Symmetry: C3
Subunit: 666 residues, 3 copies
Amino acid sequence: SAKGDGVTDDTAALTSALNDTPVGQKINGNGKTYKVTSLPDISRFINTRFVYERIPGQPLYYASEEFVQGELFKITDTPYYNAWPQDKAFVYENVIYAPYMGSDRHGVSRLHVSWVKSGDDGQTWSTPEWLTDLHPDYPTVNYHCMSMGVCRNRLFAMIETRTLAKNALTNCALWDRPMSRSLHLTGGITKAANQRYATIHVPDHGLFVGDFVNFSNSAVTGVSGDMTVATVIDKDNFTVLTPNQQTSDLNNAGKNWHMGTSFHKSPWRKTDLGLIPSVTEVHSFATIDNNGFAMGYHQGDVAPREVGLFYFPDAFNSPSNYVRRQIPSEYEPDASEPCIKYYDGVLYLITRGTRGDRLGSSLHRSRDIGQTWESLRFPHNVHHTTLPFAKVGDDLIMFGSERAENEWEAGAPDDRYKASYPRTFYARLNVNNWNADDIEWVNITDQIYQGGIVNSGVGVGSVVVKDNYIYYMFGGEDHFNPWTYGDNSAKDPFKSDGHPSDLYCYKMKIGPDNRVSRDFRYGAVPNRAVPVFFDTNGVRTVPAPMEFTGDLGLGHVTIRASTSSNIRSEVLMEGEYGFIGKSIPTDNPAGQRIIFCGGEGTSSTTGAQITLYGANNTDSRRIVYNGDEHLFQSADVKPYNDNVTALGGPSNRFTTAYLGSNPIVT
Amino acid sequence: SAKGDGVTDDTAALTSALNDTPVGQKINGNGKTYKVTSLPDISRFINTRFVYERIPGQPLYYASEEFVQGELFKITDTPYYNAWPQDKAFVYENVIYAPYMGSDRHGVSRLHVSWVKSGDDGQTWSTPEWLTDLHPDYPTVNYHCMSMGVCRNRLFAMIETRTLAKNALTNCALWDRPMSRSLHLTGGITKAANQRYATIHVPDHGLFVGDFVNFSNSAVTGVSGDMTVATVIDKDNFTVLTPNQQTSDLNNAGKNWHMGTSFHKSPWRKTDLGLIPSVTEVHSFATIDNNGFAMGYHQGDVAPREVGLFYFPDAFNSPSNYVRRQIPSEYEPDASEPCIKYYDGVLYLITRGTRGDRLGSSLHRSRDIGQTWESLRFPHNVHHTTLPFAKVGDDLIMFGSERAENEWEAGAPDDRYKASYPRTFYARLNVNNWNADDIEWVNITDQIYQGGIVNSGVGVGSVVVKDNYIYYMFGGEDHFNPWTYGDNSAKDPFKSDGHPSDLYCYKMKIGPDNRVSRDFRYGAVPNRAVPVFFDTNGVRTVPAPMEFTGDLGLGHVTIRASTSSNIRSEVLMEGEYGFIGKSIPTDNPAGQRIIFCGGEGTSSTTGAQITLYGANNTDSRRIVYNGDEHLFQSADVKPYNDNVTALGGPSNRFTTAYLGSNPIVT
Amino acid sequence: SAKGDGVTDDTAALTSALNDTPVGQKINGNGKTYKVTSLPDISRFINTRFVYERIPGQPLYYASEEFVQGELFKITDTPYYNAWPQDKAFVYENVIYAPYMGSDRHGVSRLHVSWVKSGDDGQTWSTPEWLTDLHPDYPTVNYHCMSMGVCRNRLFAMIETRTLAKNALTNCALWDRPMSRSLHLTGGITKAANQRYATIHVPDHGLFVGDFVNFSNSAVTGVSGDMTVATVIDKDNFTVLTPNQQTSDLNNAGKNWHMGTSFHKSPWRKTDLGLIPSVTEVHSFATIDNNGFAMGYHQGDVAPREVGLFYFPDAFNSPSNYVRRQIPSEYEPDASEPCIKYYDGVLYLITRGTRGDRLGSSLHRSRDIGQTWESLRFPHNVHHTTLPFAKVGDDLIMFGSERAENEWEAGAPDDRYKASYPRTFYARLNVNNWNADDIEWVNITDQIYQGGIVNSGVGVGSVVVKDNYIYYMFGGEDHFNPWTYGDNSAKDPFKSDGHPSDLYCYKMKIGPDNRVSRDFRYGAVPNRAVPVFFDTNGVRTVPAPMEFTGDLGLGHVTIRASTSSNIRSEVLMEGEYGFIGKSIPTDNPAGQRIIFCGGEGTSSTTGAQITLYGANNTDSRRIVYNGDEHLFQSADVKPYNDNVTALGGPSNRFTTAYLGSNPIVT
């Protein structure tokens, strides 16, 4: 019988067990770790962990089902190359946000900084939203973002501009925007006599002049409906301009009312930081306090390599003011893309190792926002993955994913250009024990690396905690080839299956749940993205406004009454000019024409018609105007050129001309 | 160790057990009930029930996973405010129907009475269907329905009209329609010689004159394909009028044939009941027998309240005849929205309580459809929820949901304007014992209350049994704010995440299942709402007819051959008139124009053209007609005005005019 | 206490255990088989198999949850009649393919040979793709396919033509196409001096002249991007024509490069086999080697009935050459639709039985590709189902489904025209023991047969193995009636719920899994079929090209700038001719008209206008041309007819005519 002491070789006992028990039996490992020289049939175990050295000298751990209370979700399913949640996820007012970049490749081609969100603790995710448009100077350059977070109720992001040609960083800008909120407040609105502004007391409001604010039930004259911030007095007070004034003071003290805000109706504040010296990528975000935050960076283009952070001490009054802080020099080589977070006055930083044959990921902590550090190296050259994390109690809980299977270990060569099943791991480190020598990396889920191109969208994720759950949002692929080597060298997402990378989220229980389950099986028709309802006439009806930007082929089209109290049907053409034309017919090009009709049918009987004949028509470029009156209003009827064309012909005579005077002939 | 006797405090023993076992171990409670003074980590238990008095004196019960054989499903996912299954669910011919109202608020604004259906015992649900259109007098009033069901193969619904301004009842009408069914019958069609009617014998057909009937394999001349009911003879016999008559008697006895009904192709029968006096809402539906049914109602706008039912003894012959029967007067205060059902000669009624600090929900039974009652009060002022129920064996099985967390108990204050996790409960009551003093409310699932507005869509559901499962259909929210206080005070569903309320269904095992599992994981692309197929050219193709009623922006548009053996492409414009126009260009307004062309390109080389120049064009309001022939058919070429415009001009002379006689000058 | 020995009646012991245990307890049967005289509550058991004789003398076996490691998936959800995976499934480069036919009935009306695919080992499935268009001579005939598979990197399929009227076979053609793949190669491209072709060494490329090939990093001038096969030298070598020639030899020996194939960009090779004599259906596909394959067939229309295979020894050089092989004459009566697979030099064939009262399905093996056979009959007349299978170690693993509930057994009458729950079975047969007398059919899942028509889409599936899992893909219905007998006798898929048949997949573990779980819960918005993204302005945006072929009703339409560096918006009309017309107004027919405008509004102030009046207008068939200039270019302004219409009129006089010469009056 197996020892389950993490040290005794339990392989033979486990094998005998499996051989002697029915395949449907769930073998309970009783929470113990079993050392093995080959992984057994993990699927037949519950509540079991294995230790196994795939590479000798490098134990890793492997969780059976139910060993951790956790579950994997797929959270996007879009034809874009959807990857790089690194390192942008946050939770705000009970909503989990998973920002990422949707592109067509490792680079900024077709790229939109995007997010999906969950409003039910990760069970279900929203339709992707684009946070950036294509850059004005596309396709020379386009946007990129690996650092985003919330500070005092505003979203802040480091929006980079990079070249499509080489992914070269070209500009850094801090973009920020107020988060949408509803506030249910008591008192705090005053309006002084004989002037028109009302001051609103909303602690840490985070709003700027011009930001959207909506008022309900204010009980203060003129403070009502959709308004904007007029001035900001200080961090806890702003004003709005009302339409009117009164001869006495107003104060809604004791009255309950509602505010307020909108990310979508407020402009971005964009602060141009230029091409910050010695920076390759800005990555990760750590709210420090009420006034500011840090963002991670590295420089890995020229020697010497740098890794550190930029601290923005007062991002509200002074968004252009940052200070560079670097980790100790011995930890900078072969390092990039640090993840940073801040808890109880301690800034934590974990690097990505860039190669399996040199010292890799290292962990650092600072009590002075990066001026000085205490450092440790993870054993065995952890590389190719970022290590996003959160702190739960004493423990840093960190997640990482190999990019392709069997790359995780020190000395393991890259193994690309073939389909494989990369491992995703997590580990816990107690900050009061500050040593990683005996760190246990636990493989909790396996992803797919498609193999059709060298690049991998797997991993490079982001971590958040909400209530008693920790969430790791990260990329994963599937076996559908993007056909880069194939018929889609242009990487068009909308051909065949597009790009296999999509986002996943591992949700792991981190503390007790003192409620009955909120879990459901999703059995609805997903009806948010293209909301469809069968109308009372049995026809699929979409009431949402929509934009189709791709080429559209339509069959029979009816344009319904829609406009000016539904008196008219309307089509509006944009651009410099509109073109309505006629293709060359496949079968009978000799019939090429368009009929325009004021009535319901092709017969001239139903209404006046103008028929424009094609150049391929038997009657090449003929126009026939067919009506019971032809009335030319507002201008003379003239030939385009002078003395070149006629009225009538010998075989097409007008009966006469009704004139107010004799012809003027010259 | 823990006693699991439901009385002994098992808190400490349960904690010791949890501290001493691995988190992944499923602690089996052996179906026992354990009294606790605080709820433990419920997620680590299976087959365990806890009794806990959150409010002392008020024990409630909390089920771990697997204690009940049950599962929660999400069944709608639409941007409308989808709530109020109350109390309309029914099953008909193996299909489960979950009707509800999809609006934008607690009111009739933007409201359609809707349903979703399941054809696989609750695993998957259909695309929402709208049962009502917006009222003709929208937006002054609109429809509303909380009472719907089936009697003798017809759907009956009380369709109310209510004001948008105050949700005030304006009109009640009974609307009914035949349900669609296929019947496989032998014999029963006869056709007398020398006349055109055929009599069809279909037991309890439930059809009226004008209702749709389809015939197959009848073996009776003229009885074939899509037909309508010409006359109804009695409840078991009707006629159709055929095209022809014959000199011999037809009788299809012994022959197998098929019919033939349609909900969609049959008109509603609408019986205007006016503003039924002393009614606030009609709610719930109890089929009594082959002739009629009852509907619940209450009046709660003014004192004194009424709560009771309307019995329609013969809804087929006499839909406008009903009798009102009130519950006993002591049970009417603070009561509303009765759920009613009829089983084996007994009418059961359960009220909603309106106040946590006043006597609440009560249960009533009657053996003469509400003339006499036996009554019972639920302990502890059950309130804010309806209690839809079914009877299974000797038990009433009833379900209820608090609307926001911690509101269930007697004396518990409403707690709105903050996100929470409301509890959903069920209870059994033995009808022979007829005593609710020791009722056991079992919390089986928790929902979300969003908190952005005071109203909640959670709960207020409906219950049905199918085979050995009971189904509770009800509302639940998520954490996505509707931004009512924010940028969407207008409550437009199609902005942002729309409204968080959608429908769920709790599916509970109620009897033995003597079959292997039917369950599946859904892994398909949902392809019913907008059916897409990648065509042989690799382009997404939708073959279903579709209506887009929201504003549409399109890119490049090709209208394909579709009409009259696909000889033509066709666009029809509706309304009083059509308008095809040109926006003011952003960059080059001086270029504003539309080119209409009978050929494929902007060059006049490809076909005849007419170009209409915009007012912003350099050549303001110019028209150029460009063809190799300009032929004016059916009418004189005339100026709009008299002696106002000329033919040609001094720099644009016509070479000559070809006339049949000299000009008439005057 | 139950014996669990497969023979002793355990009914009473099992009833006693069930009565004595809480309902939530999972009763562990320890992988034993329990004999019962009635099936108990199977849902309360885990790891339990029952033996039960529903018909005396015909024991079948019934699996509780967890007895087999397996899961049912739903893999299509489309309004088409989706059925008949038989017998076409295959795996290729890690992608599981599930081809089927999507039609409107048992027959070829509306039919497209289709597939869905899985890129994650069956968890999630692709948007349906159509492999065939409607036949050129539709609706007289249409395509059909029940035999498809892969041989040397090419998809081969027997594409049949059948009448709509009777489903009578009209023609057989072998269609083949290269499969899409990306190849990562070293060396193998040479280009001799002074000529334009490069020869490409790709072992077993399976390409033909004109097939698509894409090249990356070749290091050989002109071998770049999208190309086509110019000549095939032999099975391992082909040439491509480049744009240019060099004066020295090029050879990329030692260099790493990539190719480059495409199913979609390569034409089918279609080999007309005519009307193959004595064939009802070609069904199933077995790859034999590098050169060819076999396809099953039967003939069941006239005597003698046949069952066998057609072996294509060299389908690459000689696709029109095949040899007919029949199974032994005693097994041919009452048999059809053979499933065939080839393993380690042995060809296996399993028939479908046509009736339950005659000897049914039989199994055959051949070591000479069907010339001689060893055979065995399955006990109890297995009928109505095909028995697709795979070989895993020493076992054939086969799957089958009764078409409606209780049809499986010998002597069981067809039970149609009522809803039921048909059982799906699998069984193992050890090929060494080669004896089926005690074969164990194990019921592992139940489907739905809708009952609205006599036909069933349930079952008739297909089987593949990928890694350590076997996959059975097959049909199932739901309770939603197609209303064939009802308002949809035309069987239009896009009315109501369309057709209830859709595809499912039972994924069963067949070997050890030495990886941690890949399983995820799908929580994403499905965003492949109609990819929607919320744009930065908050509006749903679909960037994919799309075709809408069903009738479309649109509301307000804007055609945005799309064409020629977005200078213009563009509408192209196809067909012989285009028609833009105006329906008769509902409320004001007297206003019927269309306004065409070069500017943004109805006011002629915004732009030049032409208004075509409807015949129903007060100004019937009037045309008003309203511009500040009317210029007729390229042609005379003429009347259509000679000497019939005038210029001007007595109340509409032109002021004068400006001419270069006097009118020519004649």
